[PDB]
Design a binder for this molecule. Structure first.
Ligand code: HEM
Ligand code: HEM
Lengths: 442, 442
């Protein structure tokens, strides 16, 4: 029974229930649970995911110790979760020297240079995006952003990772769109993690095996974008190749479509921001010119908008590292096996660092005020050697979509639209109700 | 499915069955399974304990790489087994830096110096041993060695680890003898290791919890022999103290009584060895003199006898290390998570290194022939930084018993006695039928 651990270390925290730990307190969302705990306990506090002790830390210096300085030595790995199957080879799930190998093997794939060659191809789908939107916009009818954005981000990730060029909203039949489209239980495997090994020997996997096979076969026909870069330490393997691609599609799809939805909601409810953004796009790109790599990096306000949205909606919600060994960081003892958690969502809406945390104010990120922003408070992409390897790609992909979408259209709230936007209470950062706006042509 | 692993590495081995792996081949004893595999596959071979791949290695240079050179870096830990509970803190079960701490904290307790202070107290029980034996011997009746030896080794371990002086064969009521005396399922948790975490969260433990409590309480009344040495890196803890003692009693009891039984069986079936041993004891210790520390270390033949018995009956049977990371030792790749196993029993009865391996011949260990004996073939106490920490104590304890027993008695086979001795087919090196001999007074 490890439920005495925090009270044995003098660390405050909500009293756990037996077996359950604190998970019942997730009933309002664990983001709301983190903020509440931050408010009532201060800088450090402990709670239990079933029998798993989790130490929340909010000190910026502690966060850097954990994310940067002591990462290879102590805090290398995320929380084991599963059942996972062959996806244990995925970089985001791999541990210690295996993760190190995959990070070293995958780093050159996510440089500025490979992104600059990807901008022309991902631009092709900005243009389909505008057409499908123009259609759903000419309907005069409120549009579901997650359906045109979910089609776009889909369209992008497949061609950048396998070169397959499809319009998911209009060729909804290509087996590659089919397979890729397919991708309550979480609640249970946190209070019953002793059951993960059972699901593992039963071939049970949270990733649909029905699909996975399709991919490993699609890789072999390509064996003679992301796939080539990997095909072209010790070298990667065939099945390893597939696990990494699967992680990329998940990352490319649900993050991008969700964030874009969040962006457009903020732009619709702040018309002045939307206009100012469009004026910047129109000045850098006269007469609806084609977005390019070098152009995107000149749009400061566009950058300020994405950053402030990511402040309000950091889709990772929490960063986590498992403590591999007894250690004493910044003046407190962390025992082996505790999960150290950085509550980014709560840190991004903390009044200690943010005046009016709940308002959407891109100027917090202006060249004037950006300097006052602590990189271990504001961590939408994490930090240290295990940060979001696709951060530059994600921002380019979102920005290229935003540019082309705003060059052609404006976004107003509908009688439908949920204002204020509410967040889903699940385990993913997404709107409760889908975002829908009036889209007018410029 | 990891059942293709060995055939994927080019490593021969018996074809596994699904889920079961090779465990059905344990039906004749896994010692017999190791010898058979050694005979049909050669120096290296792989098999599966359910889904756990095990690589058997017999090359002396490979064995040293695994046991000595690469121990801290790769092969630090034994196979996880359980459910274990608080006994995960026991040194023999602990892993990586925790094991390192306990090994460093326990090493000074097992020196020559602490043994020399223990010889007088453990001598007191050689004398009870002779009395209870004399009684069971004056019965004229065949004697069950494991009952007088099991009482002695019991009597020794309790006073050397808690100072409690009892005659287990005649004060069979003292709560300390009671509790300590109390200490099919193995078959199941090797083909269902995915069930160990379940038994863990159910407080289920292979070590009777009914007992364990008694001990941790007996430690606190002593908190104000082994216990003091520990009470008297980072310092040890109270519960940690108890887990280590429990390991010592298991080690002190079943190893010593079993080996002594094996010894006396060999001495009874080789009267010339027994006599020659008694002549040595009588010359070093005239007129049934008291065995002492310095005296024991002068009895070369006594030493040769124990060593040859340990060759025939190495109670550990196998040494094991888990491979912590992909490595390539002595010209072959070992993947992470494989259990590397040294089949000591089979290596001790291999004709490559042993002329007439099945005969009991103490002269193999004579100062003449001892030099030709490879320390990575003959490994009754293992090797490297994780070897048997109580080896010197075990040999002294056995030898002091043997000396006093042979000074007073001789041991002949009975109509009962099982000749040839057969080995139990369980998971412990012990006689099938208990050893019983005629014991005559000298
Ligand atoms: C707005 C979009 C995205 C955001 C906000 C985001 C954020 C994050 C965060 C916060 C982490 C954990 C970092 C940490 O623990 O310190 C992470 C990990 C990761 N991200 Fe992203 N991500 C995004 C999109 C992407 C995309 C599009 C890809 C690839 C196509 C990607 C690839 C990864 C990988 C592979 C990891 C695990 C890295 C490792 O363990 O070495 N991400 N991301
Ligand atoms: C004839 C008697 C004994 C024999 C043949 C024996 C043999 C062994 C062997 C073969 C190992 C594993 C070594 C390896 O993996 O390299 C071992 C481990 C160990 N032995 Fe013994 N043993 C005996 C008695 C004892 C006694 C009496 C004690 C203590 C009271 C003891 C304490 C230990 C411990 C604590 C370990 C685990 C060490 C670690 O993991 O650091 N042994 N023993």
């Amino acid at each position: 029974h490890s439920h005495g651990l925090f009270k044995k270390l003098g660390i405050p925290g909500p009293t756990p229930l037996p077996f359950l730990g604190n998970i019942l307190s997730y009933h309002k969302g664990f983001c709301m649970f983190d903020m509440e705990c931050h408010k009532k306990y201060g800088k450090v506090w402990g709670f239990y995911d079933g029998q798993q002790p989790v130490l929340a830390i909010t000190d910026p210096d502690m966060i850097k110790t954990v994310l940067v300085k002591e990462c290879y030595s102590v805090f290398t790995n995320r929380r084991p979760f599963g059942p996972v199957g062959f996806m244990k080879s995925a970089i985001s799930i791999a541990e210690d020297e295996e993760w190190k190998r995959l990070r070293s093997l995958l780093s050159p794939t996510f440089t500025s240079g490979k992104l600059k060659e990807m901008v022309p191809i991902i631009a092709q789908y900005g243009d389909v995006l505008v057409r499908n939107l123009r259609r759903e916009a000419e309907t005069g009818k409120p549009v579901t952003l997650k359906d045109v954005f979910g089609a776009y981000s889909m369209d992008v990730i497949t061609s950048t990772s396998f070169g397959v060029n499809i319009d998911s909203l209009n060729n909804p039949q290509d087996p590659f769109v089919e397979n890729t489209k397919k991708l309550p239980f979480f609640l249970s495997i946190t209070v019953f993690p002793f059951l993960i090994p059972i699901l593992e020997v039963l071939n049970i996997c949270v990733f649909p095996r029905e699909v996975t096979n399709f991919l490993r076969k699609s890789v072999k026909r390509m064996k003679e974008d992301f796939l080539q870069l990997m095909i072209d330490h010790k070298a990667l393997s065939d099945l390893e190749l597939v696990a990494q691609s699967i992680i990329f599609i998940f990352a490319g799809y649900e993050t991008t479509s969700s964030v874009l939805s969040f962006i457009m909601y903020e732009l619709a409810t702040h018309p002045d921001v939307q206009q100012k953004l469009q004026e910047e796009i129109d000045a850098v790109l006269p007469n609806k010119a084609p977005p390019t790599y070098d152009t995107v990096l000149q749009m400061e306000y566009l950058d300020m908008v994405v950053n402030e949205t990511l402040r309000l909606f950091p889709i990772a919600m929490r960063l986590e590292r498992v403590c591999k060994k007894d250690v004493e960081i910044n003046g407190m003892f962390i025992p082996k096996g505790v999960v150290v958690m950085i509550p980014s969502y709560a840190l991004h809406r903390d009044p200690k660092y943010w005046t009016e945390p709940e308002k959407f104010l891109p100027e917090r990120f202006s060249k004037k005020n950006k300097d006052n922003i602590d990189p271990y408070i504001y961590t939408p992409f994490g930090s240290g050697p295990r940060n979001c390897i696709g951060m530059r790609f994600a921002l380019m992909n979102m920005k290229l979509a935003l540019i082309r979408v705003l060059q052609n259209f404006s976004f107003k709230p509908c009688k439908e639209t949920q204002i204020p936007l509410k967040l889903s209470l699940g385990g993913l950062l997404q709107p409760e109700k889908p975002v829908v706006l009036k889209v007018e042509s410029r």
